[PDB]
């Protein structure tokens, strides 16, 4: 839509900014706030009138060689205060108090790089991490427990790059460098019981370690959508949007056209393609698209600084309406975009450590 570019800035490290996220848990009446991640830091900024991007404070890791790749917001389920999780090459998930930028606590399992964090859409304590070690991990950050590891030889066979929960957090689609997209249901009796037990675990009141589920079989798998690394995935209701580095976002579903997603069996060998949104000059990998809170729109930047925005408020996915946003000084690769919760601001972040603000 009618976005215009109102400001830009550049962070002093001059390294790629791999991630950006608005805080969609920001309180009514408070300014909109987004986090960026790159180098060994996470930084918060607040959006103000006349395009102003006000710098607040950063968390910088003790290790000069950490490189954060991803971040995700949630809130504390007892106090409501927002929390920010960040992770990257060291394989350590940090939970940061965004007010003071203190690291409240940290988790290690992957010890191996973490490429995407996502919080469950209904339970602010359930955090999913995906790793260079080929596994996804589900953590409960209220009881500090590893609920489950999704892996095995029928899991991913190379780095996992992205994943996403469906609308109700019943199932996850993951994707990665093995070219595949895998479905993992977490509303099975086994996983619902595992989540319930994680909430019952308090290591001060018992002698047992908490046992993690090892989930070694996905509920569906395909390598038939893309022919290279699959680096971003999002559910759109029961359909999937996914991309690789082949200048396309494919909209598809498991099974045949009339197959209900909850009747798909793990042996399902067909997929249905509902449409494909092509674009240009985005053939490097780790380039992530984002949607607004309502899933009316989708944004992706490319490797020369162009933004594509598709309006998905149309009757079928292939009728999406595309708008492009360019600025003569924005020429570096855009790695991720984020919309504000009210959809009035889109930020893009770049490989040259620049930040670009477009206002509706």
From Swiss-Prot:
Modified residues (N6-methyllysine): 118, 189, 205
Species assigned in the record: Homo sapiens (Human)
GO BP terms in the entry: cellular response to leukemia inhibitory factor; facultative heterochromatin formation; genomic imprinting; heterochromatin formation; negative regulation of DNA-templated transcription; negative regulation of transcription by RNA polymerase II; oligodendrocyte differentiation; regulation of adaxial/abaxial pattern formation
Positions carrying N6,N6-dimethyllysine: 118, 189, 205
Coiled-coil stretches noted in the UniProt entry, renumbered to this chain: none
UniProt keyword Transcription present: yes
Implicated disorder: Cohen-Gibson syndrome: An autosomal dominant overgrowth disorder characterized by accelerated osseous maturation, advanced bone age, skeletal abnormalities including flaring of the metaphyses of the long bones, large hands with long fingers and camptodactyly, scoliosis, cervical spine anomalies, dysmorphic facial features, and variable intellectual disability.
GO molecular function, one term: methylated histone binding
Post-translational modification remark: Methylated. Binding to histone H1 'Lys-26' promotes mono-, di-, and trimethylation of internal lysines.
Domain of life per record: Eukaryota
Region Required for interaction with the matrix protein MA of HIV-1: start-end pairs: 70-224, 222-360
Protein name: Polycomb protein EED
Annotated Gene Ontology cellular component terms: chromatin silencing complex; cytosol; ESC/E(Z) complex; nucleoplasm; nucleus; pronucleus; sex chromatin
Modified residues (N6,N6,N6-trimethyllysine): 118, 189, 205
UniProt family annotation: Belongs to the WD repeat ESC family.
Tissue expression as described in the entry: Expressed in brain, colon, heart, kidney, liver, lung, muscle, ovary, peripheral blood leukocytes, pancreas, placenta, prostate, spleen, small intestine, testis, thymus and uterus. Appears to be overexpressed in breast and colon cancer.
Record note on what altering residue 286 to A does: Abolishes binding to H3K27me3
Subunit structure: Component of the PRC2/EED-EZH2 complex, which includes EED, EZH2, SUZ12, RBBP4 and RBBP7 and possibly AEBP2. The minimum components required for methyltransferase activity of the PRC2/EED-EZH2 complex are EED, EZH2 and SUZ12. Component of the PRC2/EED-EZH1 complex, which includes EED, EZH1, SUZ12, RBBP4 and AEBP2. The PRC2 complex may also interact with DNMT1, DNMT3A, DNMT3B and PHF1 via the EZH2 subunit and with SIRT1 via the SUZ12 subunit. Interacts with HDAC, HDAC2, histone H1 and YY1. May interact with ITGA4, ITGAE and ITGB7. Interacts with CDYL. Interacts with BMAL1. (Microbial infection) May interact with the MA protein of HIV-1.
Keyword Repressor included in the entry's annotation: yes
Effect of residue 285 to L: Abolishes binding to H3K27me3
Domain notes: The WD repeat domain mediates recognition of trimethylated histone peptides at the consensus sequence Ala-Arg-Lys-Ser. This is achieved through an aromatic cage encircling the methyllysine, and involving Phe-18, Tyr-69 and Tyr-286.
Biological role: Polycomb group (PcG) protein. Component of the PRC2/EED-EZH2 complex, which methylates 'Lys-9' and 'Lys-27' of histone H3, leading to transcriptional repression of the affected target gene. Also recognizes 'Lys-26' trimethylated histone H1 with the effect of inhibiting PRC2 complex methyltransferase activity on nucleosomal histone H3 'Lys-27', whereas H3 'Lys-27' recognition has the opposite effect, enabling the propagation of this repressive mark. The PRC2/EED-EZH2 complex may also serve as a recruiting platform for DNA methyltransferases, thereby linking two epigenetic repression systems.
Record's note on what induces expression: Expression is induced by E2F1, E2F2 and E2F3.
């Amino acid at each position: 839509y009618s976005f215009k570019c109102v400001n830009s800035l550049k962070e002093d490290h001059n390294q790629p900014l791999f991630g950006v996220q608005f805080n969609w848990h920001s309180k009514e009446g408070d300014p909109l706030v987004f986090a960026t991640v790159g180098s060994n830091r996470v930084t918060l900024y607040e959006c103000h009138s006349q395009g102003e991007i006000r710098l607040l404070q950063s968390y910088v890791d003790a290790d000069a060689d950490e490189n954060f790749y991803t971040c995700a917001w949630t809130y504390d389920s007892n106090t409501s205060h927002p929390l920010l999780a960040v992770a990257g090459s060291r394989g350590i998930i940090r939970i940061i108090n965004p007010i003071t930028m203190q690291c409240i606590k940290h988790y290690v399992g992957h010890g191996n790089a973490i490429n995407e964090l996502k919080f469950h859409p209904r339970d602010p304590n359930l955090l999913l991490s995906v790793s260079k070690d080929h596994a996804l991990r589900l953590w409960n950050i209220q009881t500090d427990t590893l609920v489950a590891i999704f892996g095995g030889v029928e899991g991913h066979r190379d780095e996992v790059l992205s994943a996403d929960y469906d609308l109700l957090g019943e199932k996850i689609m993951s994707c990665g460098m093995d070219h595949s997209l895998k479905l993992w249901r977490i509303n099975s009796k086994r996983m619902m019981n595992a989540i319930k037990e994680s909430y019952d675990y308090n290591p001060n009141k018992t002698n047992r370690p908490f046992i993690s589920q090892k989930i070694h079989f996905p509920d569906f798998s395909t390598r038939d959508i893309h022919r290279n690394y699959v680096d971003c995935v999002r559910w759109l209701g029961d359909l999937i949007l996914s991309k690789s580095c082949e200048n396309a976002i494919v909209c598809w579903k498991p099974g045949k056209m009339e197959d209900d997603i909850d009747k798909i069996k793990p042996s399902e060998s067909n997929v249905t393609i509902l449409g494909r949104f092509d674009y240009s000059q985005c053939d490097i990998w780790y380039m992530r698209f984002s949607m607004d809170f309502w899933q009316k729109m989708l944004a992706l930047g490319n490797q020369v600084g162009k933004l594509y925005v598709w309006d998905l408020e149309v009757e079928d996915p292939h009728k999406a309406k595309c708008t492009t946003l360019t600025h003569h000084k924005c020429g570096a690769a855009i790695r991720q975009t984020s919309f504000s919760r009210d959809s009035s601001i889109l930020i893009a972040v770049c490989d040259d450590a620049s930040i670009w603000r477009w206002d509706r």
